[PDB]
Structures are given as structure tokens and as C-alpha cells.
């Protein structure tokens, strides 16, 4: 009995990849199908060895190795759309390795994933990663506040928001984390009680002056 | 009855390493798998000798041995991603051992771990250990206060933080202690209630808090 017959009737949600260390990797796509395919190998109706992989859990696994053997590295995400040839989105304006060191990094990442054939390393840009987060945060008309600093940016959304701006901020943030990850740009949706949605002015002698972003917010009498 | 079959069905979560003192080592990776593998060797269904090693309890054992024979040492962690060759993250700007004393330290650390072939002692910079702790703390929009002193730094997080901020602080402290350890940089989260919620106050150079229409409070700086 082969492994692709011991799973369900719909033989299109799991993809069986032959490994290089004489194993067999089942490639699910979410957390429900991962426990659906792990119960099969847990009850033990298979005589060889088999492992279940993912896209999230195989992305927190080879980042633990990477902040021990390659610290001070700038990167975004590893994409597993074609699971035999993954794409490693590396950052361009924050690293200094040459072409010879990138072949060593592409070989030591190939040795970590025995189901893969060759890891492709593409140097994505660094200003389009924040431009695609600000144009998408301005398209839903959400009150945001950008905080640029060295080696990452941060968008904060505060105030007494309503239910539409909460459902729209959750819907955009979860569609942005899936593409870029939370390594460079981070979102800060928090609910306080002030009718001004984050911004604050002080009034004296000429009009209003825009204050700098601080921790304290003025509560709303309204 | 070999040891790799006396454990569970999944032969992936454990890793059996042969030792040098004629003893087998089972390398778990958390406490639940440690008590799962120590129950097997404790109930007695294995004839020869075996031990259960861990990431943490081996890191707190060669730090008990280290501060008796090698005091006044500046180090961070021992990394066990490949257990037959651990990495010893030593400091660079805080100790002046030569190349011969680093080979003596790399042989006395190998003699404590009978499953290790060699120990890879790597020296590391001391500025990026605090820069990675401050640039990751500025990103999460947390109020903090750096206290630099000789031989360690200290970040103090104060205020009346809400529930989002006390969860973003705990996930960053827990994700930073795994890599660097609490030897150089120390975090300190203390939270307290805000005195000025419905009060009127003046801030700046001469600051005071009005606790009543007829009550002034002058806080000492």
C-alpha cells in the first residue's frame, strides 16, 4: 500500500515528495490538513518512514538554524509554491555578501531541505516592501501612523475604531503577512478610547500645532 | 531490543547519539519529550546505560562547571543545533585569552561532553548584542529606558501597558532569550497604575499635578 492511497478519497490536497535521505514528505497546505495527514502516520499504517511538512512550520524551522549560523542577515520569506524548487526572498540594500558567498548560502540551505532540488535566491528590493504596505494601508482609508527607523518600519493604528475599520485592517494585515512576513514591517492595531484616531494637537496663540507621536493619549470627553 | 524502537512510533523527535564513555544519549528538545523519554529509562525496559540530554539542562550544567575552574569569563550561550559539534558563543571585547588558551578551553569543553566530536568556539562582537535588543524593541512601539553600565546593559519598561503591549513584549523577550541568553542584556518589565487619568497637570521644566482644585503635587525628578 502506497502512501497516496492511505489518505482520503480526494487525492489532490496532499502531494507526496520523495526525499534524499530515504524518506517521504507529505506536503499539506494548512493546519487542518496537517493533523489529517499526521493522524495516518501516528496510528501507524505505513511500514516506511514519512514526515508531514508545511509552509509555516517549515519557515520557523529553517530560521532557527539561520539565526545561529548566519546571524545579522536580512531576509523576508521562503516561498513553497513549487515544493521541489523553493524561492528565498533575500534583501538587497542591507546585505554585503558577494556572488561566491551566495552560492555557499544556497548550498547550505539546500542541505537543510532534503525534499528540494535547488533553492533559488532572489534579491528583492527594500523600498517597494514599504511602498506596498503604505499604498495598501491608504487604499482602505485607515488612520495610520508611519514610524521609519533603521532596519524596519512600523505602522500604528489606534483610537476608538468601528467594526468596519477593524475588519478591514485584519483583512489587509493577514493578506500582507502571507506575502512579505513580519520581519521588516509590523502593524500595531490597538483599541483605546479617544474619538481622535491617534493624532493629537495643542492650541496656542496662532492655531493648532501637530504634536509628535508619544505614548500618552488624551481620553475623550464627548 | 534497541533503544530507538523503545521510544514512540514517530522516529523523528528523538536522536540517539553514541557516547565515548560507553553510554547512549537521547537528545530531546523540550521538557515534554524529556519526561517522555525519561519514563522509558526509569521504568527499566533497557539493559545498558542511557541518559536523556536537553538543550537547557546541558546549558546550565557546563555553566556550573565553568564558574569554578574558569571564573571571570564573558560568554553568551552554547548552541546545540548540530549536537555532534556545538558552537560556543564567546565574547570578543571583554576577555583577552590567546590562541593557546582558546585551544585549552576547547579541549576542556570537549572532555565534558562525550557525544561531541569537537567544540567550535566563536568570538562575537559586543555592540550588536545590544543593538539587536534595542532595534527590536523600538520596532514594537514599547516605552523603554536603557541603562548602560560596565559589563552588561539593562532595559526598563514601565508604565500602564495594555494587553497588546504586554503580549508584544513577552513574545520579543522570549524570542531574544533563545538566541542570546540572559548573560549580557537584561530586560525588566514592571507595570503600575497611572496617577493622571482625570487629573490636570503641567509638563515641561516646572511640572506639577493637580489632584483637586486646591491640591498641588510636585514630583521630584
Amino acid at each position: 500500500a502506497e502512501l497516496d492511497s492511505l489518505l482520503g478519497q480526494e487525492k489532490e490536497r496532499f502531494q507526496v515528495l520523495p526525499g534524499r535521505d530515504k524518506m517521504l514528505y507529505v506536503a499539506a497546505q494548512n493546519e487542518r490538513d496537517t493533523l489529517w495527514a499526521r493522524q495516518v502516520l501516528a496510528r501507524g499504517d505505513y511500514d516506511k518512514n514519512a514526515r508531514v511538512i508545511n509552509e509555516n512550520e517549515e519557515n520557523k524551522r529553517i530560521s532557527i538554524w539561520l539565526d545561529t549560523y548566519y546571524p545579522q542577515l536580512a531576509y523576508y520569506r521562503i516561498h513553497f509554491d513549487e515544493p521541489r524548487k523553493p524561492v528565498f526572498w533575500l534583501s538587497r540594500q542591507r546585505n554585503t555578501m558577494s556572488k561566491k558567498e551566495l552560492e555557499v548560502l544556497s548550498q547550505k540551505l539546500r542541505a537543510l531541505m532534503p525534499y528540494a532540488d535547488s533553492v533559488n535566491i532572489t534579491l528583492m528590493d527594500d523600498v517597494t516592501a514599504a511602498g506596498q504596505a503604505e499604498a495598501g494601508l491608504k487604499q482602505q482609508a485607515l488612520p495610520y501612523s508611519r514610524r521609519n527607523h533603521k532596519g524596519g518600519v512600523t505602522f500604528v493604528i489606534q483610537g476608538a475604531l468601528d467594526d468596519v475599520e477593524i475588519l478591514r485592517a485584519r483583512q489587509f494585515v493577514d493578506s500582507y503577512y502571507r506575502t512579505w512576513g513580519g520581519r521588516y514591517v509590523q502593524f500595531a492595531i490597538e483599541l483605546k478610547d479617544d474619538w481622535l484616531k491617534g493624532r493629537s494637537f495643542q492650541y496656542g496663540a496662532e492655531g493648532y500645532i501637530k504634536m509628535s507621536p508619544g505614548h500618552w493619549y488624551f481620553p475623550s470627553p464627548l | 531490543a534497541e533503544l530507538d524502537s523503545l521510544l514512540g512510533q514517530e522516529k523523528e523527535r528523538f536522536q540517539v547519539l553514541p557516547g565515548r564513555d560507553k553510554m547512549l544519549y537521547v537528545a530531546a528538545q523540550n521538557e515534554r519529550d524529556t519526561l517522555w523519554a525519561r519514563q522509558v529509562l526509569a521504568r527499566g525496559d533497557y539493559d545498558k546505560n542511557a541518559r536523556v540530554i536537553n538543550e537547557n539542562e546541558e546549558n546550565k550544567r557546563i555553566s556550573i562547571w565553568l564558574d569554578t575552574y574558569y571564573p571571570q569569563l564573558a560568554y553568551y550561550r552554547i548552541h546545540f543545533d548540530e549536537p555532534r559539534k556545538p558552537v560556543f558563543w564567546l565574547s570578543r571585547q571583554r576577555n583577552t585569552m590567546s590562541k593557546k588558551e582558546l585551544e585549552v578551553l576547547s579541549q576542556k569543553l570537549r572532555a565534558l561532553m562525550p557525544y561531541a566530536d569537537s567544540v567550535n568556539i566563536t568570538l562575537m562582537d559586543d555592540v550588536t548584542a545590544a543593538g539587536q535588543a534595542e532595534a527590536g524593541l523600538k520596532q514594537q512601539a514599547l516605552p523603554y529606558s536603557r541603562r548602560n553600565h560596565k559589563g552588561g546593559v539593562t532595559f526598563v519598561i514601565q508604565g500602564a501597558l495594555d494587553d497588546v503591549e504586554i503580549l508584544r513584549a513577552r513574545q520579543f523577550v522570549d524570542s531574544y532569550y533563545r538566541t542570546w541568553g540572559g548573560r549580557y542584556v537584561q530586560f525588566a518589565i514592571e507595570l503600575k497604575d497611572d496617577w493622571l487619568k482625570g487629573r490636570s497637570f503641567q509638563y515641561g521644566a516646572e511640572g506639577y499635578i493637580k489632584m483637586s482644585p486646591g491640591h498641588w503635587y510636585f514630583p521630584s525628578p
Binding site: 495643542q202 509628535s212 | 490636570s200 509638563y203 499635578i209
Partner: peptide, 26 residues
């Protein structure tokens, strides 16, 4: 203890007698 970055007076429902004494130093 009083976290605001700048300089200014914050009045939360004062009564125009407590308020003008804050301007009585400037």
C-alpha cells in the same frame, strides 16, 4: 511619572480660575 514629550498645560474640565493660574507664570 508624567509622560509627555513637549511642554504645555493639559486641562481636563478646569474652571477658568485654576486655568489662568497656570498662565500666571508665563
Amino acid at each position: 511619572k508624567i509622560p509627555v514629550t513637549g511642554s504645555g498645560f493639559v486641562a481636563k474640565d478646569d474652571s477658568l480660575r485654576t486655568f489662568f493660574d497656570a498662565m500666571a507664570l508665563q
